[PDB]
Amino acid sequence: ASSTFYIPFVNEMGEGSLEKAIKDLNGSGFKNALIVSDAFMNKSGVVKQVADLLKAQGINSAVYDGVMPNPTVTAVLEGLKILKDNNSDFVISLGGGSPHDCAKAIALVATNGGEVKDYEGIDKSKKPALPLMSINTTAGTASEMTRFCIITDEVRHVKMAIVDRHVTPMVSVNDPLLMVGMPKGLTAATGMDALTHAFEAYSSTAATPITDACALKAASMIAKNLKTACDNGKDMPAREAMAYAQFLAGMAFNNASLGYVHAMAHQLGGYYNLPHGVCNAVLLPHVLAYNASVVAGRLKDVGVAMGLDIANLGDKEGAEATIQAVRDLAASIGIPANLTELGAKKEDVPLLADHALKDACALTNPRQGDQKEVEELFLSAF
Amino acid sequence: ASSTFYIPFVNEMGEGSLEKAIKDLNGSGFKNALIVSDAFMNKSGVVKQVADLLKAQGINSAVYDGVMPNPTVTAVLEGLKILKDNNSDFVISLGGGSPHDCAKAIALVATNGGEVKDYEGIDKSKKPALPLMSINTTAGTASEMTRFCIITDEVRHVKMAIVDRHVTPMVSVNDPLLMVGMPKGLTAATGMDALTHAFEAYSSTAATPITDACALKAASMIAKNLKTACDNGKDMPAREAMAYAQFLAGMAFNNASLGYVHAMAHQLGGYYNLPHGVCNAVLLPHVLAYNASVVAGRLKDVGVAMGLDIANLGDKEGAEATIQAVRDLAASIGIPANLTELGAKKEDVPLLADHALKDACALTNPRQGDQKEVEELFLSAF
Ligand SMILES: [Fe+2]
Ligand SMILES: [Fe+2]
């Protein structure tokens, strides 16, 4: 089957990539940047940092730090208000996945005029988004390079997936210098989110030789660095490795798509308002076991990439040994042991599974189940 | 580690990607396309095929089939005039490397300045190029996705290099259906060129975890499919694999750069007027032996990727086995035995070695040598 590989045409990486990306704006014509970010990014001073570097280049900026996890239409609308009142001609997301998603929606609407909901689906926008630069500060999401934009309707209580090549940032930035500050908990969660992207992309029915290569490289680098990055966030080599790893994982899932881990995790997070990262982290092992009955061999490929001594094992054993390795890694970095700790409730599963099967990510899972299998899958995670 | 990954926003691949790509143009606003290609692409009907698919989407087109192997400035001027008389609002390159570079220049000068020279260098253009779609028909160049643009101006007899993020095509197309027609010699030469890209990019001092991942995957796929595509150009799986492989090789060298193989090959190709791919092919094994003194370990990684049973060998021994594997491959697909057969004269070595060291690709070769060492390298290649 034919395929399509989406990605920003310019992707800056490594220590110093931030200064470089900002200096390249010289002669771009941009004068007013709308910086979309987290309250935590503005408090630590990262927002000022970017604002100042922009200044030195003669570029002004307005800040909207009202972005919280699970970006909503309200947040998008607020950012659009600031953009309007400042006539921002450029958008810069700063932070983790939430900021990137919110920025993409703001940028798309700014040029397409209408409502977020109108663009839910595949390539619904008629025109390119307002130019957008995405500066990533967590090592697991890759939203700074995907053509995905997921915004939550707070009123209806619904998550809308915008799959549009127009939301692909014009420039992505992955400077590990901005990731050093990630506390151990965040490092572990976003790291597992990235590992999840690798696993799901490699297991996807839309996998291609390119996504395969990226996903495996991501898994390998994660197995080699995540634990290190968690034990000591000052280890620059580890931070940089995780930055390339999460990007490679995005190169894979942005194009092969995901599976049941995210189909489900999107529900737990968007219902209990839990962190995207940790939800996938706790669900991963259980979904892999569920899929092992269909992609045992490929799961073994990932384990080998991860350095596991399973090359001489049959696929079943190799797969089970891989899953066990994921469980061990998760424990070693303190991921919560189950959905019970996450604060999930068995009474909500019937609805969680119901929405899970309707999530855009479910279509590519290797093993397709019914409203009753997904419910039982969920229950097995508590 | 302070790197930049360049690549088109959209890359269509696989059987039928050409039609999918043109179809996505419906409602794009483009009305007049400029199709840049060779004389043999226009005669064989491939141009018409594209022009008709464009008509179905309400897009008219004009054609410029004057592109000669090794793009020239006169060519860029010729295509530029055609664009003027038809008031073209976007460009489409059709063919191998030559058509792509010509189109890139045409599209860049069409919205920026008037002379090609004005853009020689890095990021010289101040404005984006006129929208460009590059449809690749050979399996080894990757010009449809690089930010490189090389144009030879007969006057000074100099090949100007335009390294600009703006010459990166807006959309790349790799449909193996348009590659089935590649005769044996061409698939072998372009195939070996892609292998060289993987080897040089993996050996490059500018390599990153991303380019490494793409390079190894490219070498792996080529090792498993090149011979088959040469023995049976009708085998779609083989052609499909080579399309993906040559793209991956591009994802790698466009970002990590190359080495002494191309530095040297570019001299033979110019100071003898020989095909790019074949010069690289014959040279490759020799340069690898030379670089082995510094990157033995990495050469072994490529050999393992290529499916060689050398995992239990030392790096020095693995590299030699990999180098021998390259020699065996080249021979099995009809690549000349040495420079003597290419029509090169030993008395030209001093001159060839001097310009090789002056080549831009020389800077990233893992082993740096002087005039003497290079002259010797060349001679040992006879
Ligand atoms: Fe995720
Ligand atoms: Fe080449």
For tokens 């020239």, the residue is: B72
CA B96 to ligand 2 centroid distance, Å: 12
CA distance A307 to A288: 18
Q: Which residues in chain A have Cβ-Cβ distances shorter than 8 Å to B12?
A: 2-4
> Of B183, B199, B219, which residue sits at a domain end?
B183
Q: Which of A144, A166, A183 is the last residue of a domain?
A: A183
- CATH number for position B317: 1.20.1090.10
Q: How far is Cα B365 from Cα B83, in angstroms, rounded to an integer? A: 39
Same-domain status, B174 and B236 = no
Q: What is the number of the ligand closest to the CA of A98?
A: 1
The 3-class SS string of chain B reads CCEEEECCCEEEECCCHHHHHHHCCCCCCCCEEEEEECHHHHHCCHHHHHHHHHHHCCCEEEEECCCCCCCEHHHHHHHHHHHHHHCCCEEEEEECHHHHHHHHHHHHHCCCCCCCHHHCEECCCCCCCCCEEEEECCCCCCCCCCCEEEEEECCCCEEEEEECHHHCCCEEEECHHHCCCCCHHHHHHHHHHHHHHHHHHHHCCCCCHHHHHHHHHHHHHHHHHHHHHHHCCCCHHHHHHHHHHHHHHHHHHHHHCCCHHHHHHHHHHHCCCCCHHHHHHHHHHHHHHHHHHHHHHHHHHHHHHCCCCCCCCCHHHHHHHHHHHHHHHHHHCCCCCCHHHHCCCHHHHHHHHHHHHHCHHHHHCCCCCCHHHHHHHHHHCC
DSSP assignment letter at A33: E
> Do B356 and B239 fall into the same domain?
yes
**Amino acid, res. B213:** A
The first and second tokens of residue B91, run together, are 């460009």
Number of Cβ within 10 Å of residue B24's Cβ equals 17
Same domain, B137 and B220: no
Answer yes or no: do B164 and B306 share one domain: no
Domain match, A334 and A200 both: yes
Mark whether A146 and A203 lie in a shared domain.
no
Residue type at B106 in one-letter notation: I
B159 is in an annotated binding site: yes
Residue A74's domain comprises 1-183
- Report the structure determination method: X-ray
Domain count, chain B: 2
Resolution in angstrom units:
2.1
Burial of residue B219 (number of CB atoms within 10 Å: 0-12, 13-18, 19+): buried
Domain stops at, among B148, B183, B218: B183
| Chain pair A-B, CB pairs under 8 angstroms | 107
Task: Give the one of A4, A244, A248 whose C-beta lies nearest to B12's C-beta.
Answer: A4
Of B4, B213, B247, the CB nearest to A214: B213
Tell me: do A133 and A216 sit in the same domain: no
CATH value at residue B80: 3.40.50.1970
| Ligand nearest to the backbone CA of A281 | 1
Same domain, A102 and A228: no
- Between CA A298 and CA B323 the distance in angstroms is 30
The H or E element containing residue A244 is helix A236-256
Tell whether residue B53 is among the known ligand binding residues: no
Ligand 1 center to residue B145 CA distance, Å? 28
Answer yes or no: do B130 and B193 share one domain. Answer: no
Same domain, A61 and A200: no
Same domain (yes/no): A102, A250 = no
Maximum pairwise Cα distance, chain B: 64
Please give the helix or strand (H or E) that residue A252 lies within, else none. Answer: helix A236-256
Min Cα separation A27/chain B (Å): 7
- Tokens linked to A286: 């259980």
A161 membership: H or E segment, kind and range:
strand A158-163
Contacts of residue B295, Cβ cutoff 8 Å, sequence gap at least 6: B203, B319, B366, B367
Question: What is the C-alpha to C-alpha distance for residues B338 and B343, in angstroms, rounded to an integer?
Answer: 9
Q: What does the angle CA B198 – CA B354 – CA B324 come to, to the nearest 5 degrees? A: 35
Same domain, A241 and A263: yes
Length of chain A: 382
* End-to-end alpha carbon distance in chain A: 38
